[PDB]
Ligand binder design. Structure first.
Ligand code: SF4
Ligand code: SF4
Ligand code: SF4
Ligand code: FES
Ligand SMILES: [Zn+2]
Lengths: 711, 441, 253, 117, 67
């Protein structure tokens, strides 16, 4: 129950067993902090949150003091003024005079709480000088400047608890206690860059970002990450033409103040291999074209080919937004094609789960549902390389509760413990018939999670009926008034939204019709068998990569940091990006390109504006008009039809499940063009813990340094 | 708001609350000689409302490209022969949006804007902005800063009056006093350029004191100048005070009564010329003024001649104040000793951590001014200069409005000038002492 | 609190060896038997490791609330070179404030009694010092001991045990001005009750007690260093002419 | 881009020293450079070459203080740890320091960043 | 603008010691202009400004793979 205390004269209620600092954020009372973070364990080390409490001889650490029945707390007394002034004097006594050369300046808690809570002048002038410690090499991503450390312990708590990376620590004792790894070794965690933001000071900073920007000259845009299927909420920091860095922002339902390194550190690939002009293939060379003489060249080819039903084919990639798929579905439909493929392997044939009921292809227990999960079965997915910040939530629930995890598929190095039940459908069949099925049966909030790798497999037909049959057998556990045990995990931002509007091959009759005109709508990981050699290929996208280099005509579209596009994440949350910058060169918005060519091809699309297309969108599925929320699947039990009734006789092959993410750093066009990810992969290949590994800086073997970054 | 869409109760207006004068004691149809048949509608046959909208008086654009315009004024004059029937001053030709630009600046970043309003009185303009922010900051600037600001406040007053009085004499035709007095002001801009690094836009007086301390030879050189400045006042006194052409160009010209001068928003000499004893440094003492003795020149006829005699007396009173400041200059800091407000010494910023953090935050974010609003006014050399500053509680002002004395004075131009000749308009522009950096802002 | 959650998260209690080494005797002999010694609120016997400038250092078991001089002058043979040669005693271990000769004369070696001296019984270690001691050196060595024995977890003792050590190392050789003695007094009181453990008190108390009874000694050698260098020292230990020799000296140093 | 005063990035260094530095040959080109005296153009010396002709300041102390040597004229006073067998550099001015405990190791390296002597 | 820098201060009464007797004219700077560098306006030696930074976005170099 919520107990009642008074803080600064005002009354506040809060659940018992809360920290007193927590009762302060409820009572609208500002309390200074360095070591305390809402998402970490309480450490008690900084001494900046000391407040006055009755019947208490000495100031109490508000972060570590349990709220009592009827305490009276003073956060503004002479005791608190004297403590905050004195602790600021201690934290600033061996702190380096490096505020001009530090990348935390203008965004520093130590200068903002020194200005608000400390004296204006220092009394520290010792002839002995300040403490100086040596710098450290913890990989290619995190530049070190350890004189700045104030010993808050936020990065060691994050690395050990949140991320499951127990390599960072604090060796030593006294004033010589030093954060780092004992041995000079790389930090191997996809959540690594999160210690840069957690760091109160700039001792742990970003190597790619070093010295480039100041925070006051940065425009702040609240957008969505599209580099995986979770739709992590991000803050995009731009200085005019150029994106400078990607920060996480709070969404406890989705990402929980964390982003992974690829979401974070691949933004430098937004400026490197871009498409800015239409190119028409002439005599085996790509020559520039005007937009008119590119759409005309497309229209002429389509007229010459005369594609009948389903000889027009469209493949959509990981980063496509719903304003493009709904616009492309309307273009192909009026051209006579229902052949609407997807970029993954097996993305050009009917899918094992259909798209009639949304609960077939979603994460039906929410991402927030893992917060309650008691038993989780994993089917053919590496939650680290697919949804890195969702993998952390599983670990968080696991450490603090009796959560049991087992998995079917390829073994993976994991941040949590799990039982490997096998690699194929025969193993999964024993898994449910065996102890983990009984564990799944006996548990409250049971959770089966199917990865999109299964949907790519030969036996997705058979895998998906096996799982759902277990679910339907076990409702009132799996299908209750408030619970959905069935989950499908998506690793690409475009795919749930593609399912939302039917952008999927309907029948093998459609899939068996060889196309002669193929539009690759941002598609770059397409299987070579899904693209005919003699088809007229049109590539639309923002990067010159595998898709653009095999096409006859390329059309420059927008990237996600320059469009306002809808994306649906793996659980069916509908989110919109916000443009951080304008369009480069002569690039267009993708749904305008599709609408523009509908003029040239003879079938113009009714809408001429984004609102008219978002009205079209909302009558394909009305959930697309409800942003930031997840709609409940009304007819949940109708998922039996496409999952079991439609998947009964399957030629099971027994081929084991695959590892669909070979390289975490390279998963799409933006990542494959990022210099920072190129250094992450290369350092991970050889283990070089050095900060300047393929970056500017002096080294012992590099006396003169280099201007090259990423080489 | 919503009710205004359709017809509702009419908002009451000054015409409604008009009252009829009592006929027992009313004497005369015009107690003012300003409206005594020296305006429009004193000739012709019909009024200019109907059947008269087809004709014009002789209308001449007096400025902007005009010497007597002293800059950037477009004074549209309607002449009946060589007599002014209507004067319409058109301003905004030096309007540069200073008050909007101040809203995208920190409080430090906005202070150089005040240098450029009355741009012969830079350090006085700086003071009124520095005293408004200091009031909203609830801080007390040290005694040495208060004595530097009053001494350079009166050095500024002399600099303005040299430009004002001798520009005014130049317009009436006297050339030589202008040349003599511009050596003295050329002398006094050394004192500016020695404490600041600028002859004109010092950026010296700032919220919290002054930017730097005066150099070690400055007080002796100011006193050396002071021992001869009396003779300078007397030789310009020697060409104009008794000159019979000076007396007949200014005596009886631009006459404003005491009760109308207040109603016209007149301040300074424009008000004190009419016989009112009023000085903002006497009535609301600021800085070190309540620590010095000075007299207040007050005229009795409210004309260009009395205003000239009051300004030539303020030369002598400013030099009198300056001497006392030199004598009473205390030791101590020239900046409030709080590094959360004023920048720390460069030595301290390079030596100590809390000094570096404070230097870094004061030059990027600025200091935060506690929320509220204030009207602060000082006796500027041209009148009551005021500022209305609204504070968010953040580091940028929400609103900075400058109350410029010459804006209030140029508005009463047609009131006092209609009926005089074209030369008398030139006489009234110079006695009213306009600088259009403050008029337009 | 260990009584709830302690070792391995289990209910726990920490107790000293001497505390536990008497309890069985407290039963076989009696609570009244043991409560027969010391003063009203202080009972029983005590061990007394009496080191320092005594002519016969030794530990001894002796009754609590014994006057210190008789404890020193009888069990340990008395102060080296006689009682008059005594200058100061640490009546507990290094974590208790120093006591000058003039208060040692009638001091009961007692939990409550040493408290009134603004000190503590501590561990009943008794370090005595002669009139030939460098007392600031003795205290500064302890301030150096605590700089090395701080864990480094919290801001006040990780930064304050090193800061206080550098001040004490300066104060030995008089590199400082007297108003810094007050500045060091303030520093210790910003540590005193602002820490995770009592080690912050353990390095602040010995400094404070030295300020409390030996400031003229601290003042005498600050004055001497000034005449030695031809000028009063600046804050931090810099010489008066630092600015003249092109050093960096903030206003007020 | 005919003369060397329009190609060499600096008189003391020919190539660029930053990732983003536009080469001089790529910025002295164009119509704005068609009747121009190239050697009259501002062509300052590269500081990256100059700082590295400084010799190492050898020291036995663990921690060195650098304030730029100018007193108030220099830079904010900082402290450089010299524990790694590597030349420690001041982050403000680039002056090189080494600890004598690595004198034998540094005088064995095939190359270095600053003159050891 | 033909007056050398140190003498520009002496002619301006900004110093009293002439550059003959002024120690700061002795700090050896190998990077300092050896020759006299006056105001170069109205000549072909007039300073021409330029971007010192590389462009901010790099376009794809097209690579049309063989069909
Ligand atoms: S962390 Fe960086 S910006 Fe903040 S106080 Fe320290 S040096 Fe200055
Ligand atoms: S490196 Fe940063 S997060 Fe880690 S202990 Fe030091 S200050 Fe805290
Ligand atoms: S007081 Fe205790 S916790 Fe704090 S630094 Fe000293 S030994 Fe460590
Ligand atoms: S916030 Fe409570 S001690 Fe650090
Ligand atoms: Zn340096």
């Amino acid at each position: 129950a919520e107990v009642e205390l008074t803080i600064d004269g005002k009354k506040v209620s809060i659940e018992a067993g809360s920290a007193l600092i927590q009762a302060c954020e409820k009572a609208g009372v500002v309390v200074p902090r360095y070591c305390y973070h809402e998402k970490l364990a309480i450490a008690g080390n900084c001494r900046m949150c000391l407040v006055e409490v009755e019947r208490s001889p000495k100031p109490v650490a508000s972060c570590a003091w349990p709220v009592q029945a009827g305490m009276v707390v003073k956060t503004n007394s002479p005791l608190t003024h004297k403590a905050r002034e004195g602790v600021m004097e201690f934290l600033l006594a061996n702190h380096p005079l490096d505020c001009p050369i530090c990348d935390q300046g203008g965004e520093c808690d130590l200068q903002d709480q020194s200005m608000r809570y400390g004296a204006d002048r220092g009394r520290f002038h010792e002839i002995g000088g300040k403490r100086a410690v040596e710098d450290k090499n913890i990989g290619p991503l995190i530049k070190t400047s350890m004189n700045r450390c104030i010993h808050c312990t936020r990065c060691v708590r994050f690395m050990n608890d949140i991320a499951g990376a127990p390599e960072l620590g604090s060796t030593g004792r006294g004033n010589d206690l030093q954060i780092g790894t004992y041995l000079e070794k790389n930090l191997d965690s996809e959540l690594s860059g999160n210690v840069i933001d957690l760091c109160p000071v700039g001792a742990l900073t970003s190597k790619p970002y070093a010295f480039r920007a100041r925070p006051w000259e940065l425009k702040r845009t609240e957008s969505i990450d599209v580099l995986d299927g979770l739709g992590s909420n991000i803050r995009v920091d731009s200085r005019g033409l150029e994106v400078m860095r990607i920060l996480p922002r709070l969404n406890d339902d989705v990402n929980e103040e964390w982003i992974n390194d690829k979401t974070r550190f691949a933004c430098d690939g937004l400026k490197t291999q871009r498409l800015t002009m239409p190119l028409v293939r002439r005599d085996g060379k790509f020559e520039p074209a005007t937009w008119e003489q590119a759409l005309t060249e497309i229209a002429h080819a389509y007229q010459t080919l005369a594609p009948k039903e389903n000889e027009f084919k469209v493949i959509a990639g990981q980063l496509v937004e719903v304003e493009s798929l709904v616009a492309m579905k309307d273009l192909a439909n009026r051209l006579g094609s229902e052949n609407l493929a997807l970029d993954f392997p097996g993305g050009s044939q009917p899918l094992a789960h259909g798209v009639d009921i949304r609960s077939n292809y979603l994460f039906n227990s929410k991402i927030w549902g893992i917060e309650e999960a008691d038993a989780i079965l994993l089917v053919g997915t590496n939650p680290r390389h697919e949804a890195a910040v969702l993998n952390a939530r599983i670990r968080k629930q696991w450490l603090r509760s009796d959560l049991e995890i087992a998995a079917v598929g390829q073994p993976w190095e994991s941040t949590f413990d799990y039982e490997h039940l096998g690699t194929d459908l025969a193993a999964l069949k024993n898994a449910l018939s065996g102890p983990f099925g009984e564990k799944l049966k006996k548990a409250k909030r049971p959770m089966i999670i199917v990865g999109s790798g299964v949907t790519e497999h030969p036996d997705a037909k058979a895998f998906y009926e096996t799982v759902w049959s277990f679910v339907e057998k076990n409702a009132s556990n799996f299908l209750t008034e408030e619970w959905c045990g069935y989950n499908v995990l998506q690793r690409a931002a475009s795919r749930a939204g593609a399912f939302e509007v039917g952008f999927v091959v309907p029948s093998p009759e459609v899939a068996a019709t060889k196309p002669k005109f193929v539009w690759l709508l941002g598609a770059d990981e397409f299987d070579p068998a899904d693209v005919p050699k003699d088809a007229f290929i049109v590539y639309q996208g923002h990067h010159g990569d595998r898709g653009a280099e095999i096409a006859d005509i390329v059309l420059p579209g927008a990237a996600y940091t320059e469009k306002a596009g809808t994306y649906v994440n793996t659980e069916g949350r509908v989110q919109m990006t916000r443009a951080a910058t304008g369009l480069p060169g002569a690039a267009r918005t993708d749904w305008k390109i599709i609408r523009a060519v509908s003029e040239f091809l003879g079938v113009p699309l009714p809408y001429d504006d984004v609102a008219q297309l978002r009205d079209r969108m909302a009558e394909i599925s009305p959930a697309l008009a409800a942003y930031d929320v997840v709609e409940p699947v009304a007819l949940r039990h109708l998922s039996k039809v496409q999952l079991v009734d439609q998947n009964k006789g399957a030629k099971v092959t027994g081929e084991p499940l695959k590892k669909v993410v070979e390289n975490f750093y390279f998963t799409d066009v933006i990542s494959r063009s990022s210099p920072t990810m190129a250094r992450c992969s290369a350092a991970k290949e050889t283990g070089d813990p050095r900060t300047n590994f393929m970056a500017p800086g002096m080294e012992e073997d590099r006396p003169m340094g280099q201007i090259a970054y990423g080489a | 708001p919503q009710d205004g869409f359709q017809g509702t109760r009419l908002i009451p207006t000054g015409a409604d609350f008009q009252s009829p004068p009592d006929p027992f004691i009313d004497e005369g149809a015009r107690d003012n000689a300003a409206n005594y048949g020296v305006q429009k509608s004193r000739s012709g046959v019909d009024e200019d409302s109907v059947e008269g909208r087809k004709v014009r008086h002789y209308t001449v654009n007096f400025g902007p490209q005009h010497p007597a315009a002293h800059g950037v004024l477009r004074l549209i004059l309607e002449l009946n022969g060589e007599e002014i029937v209507r004067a319409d001053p058109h301003v905004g030709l030096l309007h540069r949006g200073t008050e909007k630009l101040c809203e995208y600046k920190t409080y430090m970043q906005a202070l150089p804007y005040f240098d450029r309003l009355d741009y012969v009185s830079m350090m006085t303009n700086e003071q009124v902005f520095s005293l408004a922010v200091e009031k909203l900051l609830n801080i007390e600037i040290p005694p040495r800063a208060k004595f530097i600001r009053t001494m350079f406040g009166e050095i500024t007053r002399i600099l303005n009056h040299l430009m004002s009085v001798l520009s005014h004499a130049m317009d009436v035709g006297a050339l030589t006093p202008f040349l003599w007095g511009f050596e003295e002001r050329e002398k006094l801009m050394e004192f500016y350029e020695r404490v600041s690094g600028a002859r004109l836009h010092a950026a010296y007086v700032r919220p919290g004191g002054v930017h730097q301390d005066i150099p070690v030879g400055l007080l002796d050189d100011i006193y050396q100048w002071a021992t001869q400045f009396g003779d300078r006042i007397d030789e310009t006194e020697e060409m104009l005070t008794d000159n019979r052409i000076w007396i007949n160009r200014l005596k009886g010209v631009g006459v404003v009564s005491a009760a109308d001068a207040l109603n016209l928003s007149f301040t300074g000499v424009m008000l004190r010329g009419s016989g009112v004893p009023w000085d903002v440094r006497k009535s609301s003492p600021y800085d070190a003024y309540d620590q010095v003795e000075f007299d207040v020149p007050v005229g009795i006829n409210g004309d260009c001649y009395d205003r000239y005699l009051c300004r030539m007396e303020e030369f002598r009173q400013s030099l009198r104040i300056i001497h006392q400041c030199l004598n009473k200059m205390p030791a101590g800091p020239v900046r409030y000793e709080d590094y959360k407000i004023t920048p720390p010494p460069r030595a301290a910023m390079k030596e100590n951590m809390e000094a570096l953090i404070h230097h870094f935050l004061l030059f990027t974010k600025g200091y935060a001014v506690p929320p509220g609003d204030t009207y602060t006014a000082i006796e500027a050399p041209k009148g009551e200069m005021g500022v209305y500053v609204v504070s968010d509680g953040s580091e940028r002002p929400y609103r900075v409005h400058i109350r410029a004395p010459g804006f209030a004075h140029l508005s009463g131009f047609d009131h006092i000038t209609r009926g005089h000749l074209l030369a008398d308009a030139v006489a009234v522009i110079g006695t009213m002492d306009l600088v259009f950096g403050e008029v337009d802002r | 609190f260990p009584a709830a959650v302690g070792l391995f998260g289990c209910p726990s209690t920490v107790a000293n060896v001497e505390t536990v080494s008497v309890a069985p005797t407290i039963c076989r002999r009696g609570g009244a038997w043991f409560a027969s010694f010391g003063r009203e609120r202080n009972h029983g016997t005590k061990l007394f490791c009496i080191s320092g400038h005594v002519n016969n250092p030794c530990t001894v078991e002796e009754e609590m609330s014994i006057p210190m001089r008789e404890l020193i002058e009888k069990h340990c043979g008395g102060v080296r070179g006689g009682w008059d040669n005594l200058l100061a005693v640490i009546p507990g271990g290094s974590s208790t404030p120093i006591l000058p000769k003039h208060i040692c004369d009638d001091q009961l070696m007692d939990f409550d009694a040493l408290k009134d001296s603004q000190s503590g019984l501590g561990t009943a270690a008794v370090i005595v010092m002669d009139k030939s001691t460098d007392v600031v050196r003795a205290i500064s060595r302890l301030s150096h001991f605590y700089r090395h024995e701080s864990c480094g977890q919290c801001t006040p003792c990780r930064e304050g045990s090193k800061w206080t050590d550098q001040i004490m190392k300066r104060f030995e050789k008089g590199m400082g001005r007297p108003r810094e003695i007050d500045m060091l007094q303030e520093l210790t009181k910003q540590v005193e009750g602002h820490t995770i453990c009592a080690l912050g008190e353990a390095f602040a108390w010995p400094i404070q007690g030295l300020i409390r009874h030996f400031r003229p000694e601290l003042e005498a050698r600050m004055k001497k260093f000034a005449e030695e260098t031809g000028g009063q020292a600046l804050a931090g230990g810099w010489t008066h002419d630092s600015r003249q020799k092109g050093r960096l000296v903030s206003p007020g140093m | 881009g005919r003369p060397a005063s329009a190609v060499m990035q600096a008189p003391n260094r020919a190539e660029v020293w930053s990732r983003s530095q536009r080469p001089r040959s790529e910025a002295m080109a164009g119509p704005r450079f068609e009747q121009t005296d190239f050697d009259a153009q501002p062509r300052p010396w590269a500081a990256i070459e100059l700082i590295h002709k400084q010799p190492v300041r050898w020291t036995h102390d663990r921690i060195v203080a650098c304030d730029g040597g100018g007193g108030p004229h220099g830079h904010p006073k900082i402290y450089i740890n010299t524990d790694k067998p590597e030349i420690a550099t001041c982050n403000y001015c680039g002056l090189p320091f080494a600890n004598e405990h690595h004198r034998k190791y540094l005088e064995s390296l095939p190359q270095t960043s600053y003159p050891l002597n | 603008a033909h007056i050398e820098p140190m003498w520009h201060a002496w002619i301006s009464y900004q110093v009293d010691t002439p550059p003959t007797r002024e120690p700061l004219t002795q700090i050896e700077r190998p990077w300092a202009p050896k020759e006299h560098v006056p105001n170069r306006s109205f000549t072909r030696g007039a300073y021409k400004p330029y971007n010192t930074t590389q462009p901010k976005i790099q376009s794809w170099e097209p690579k049309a793979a063989p069909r």
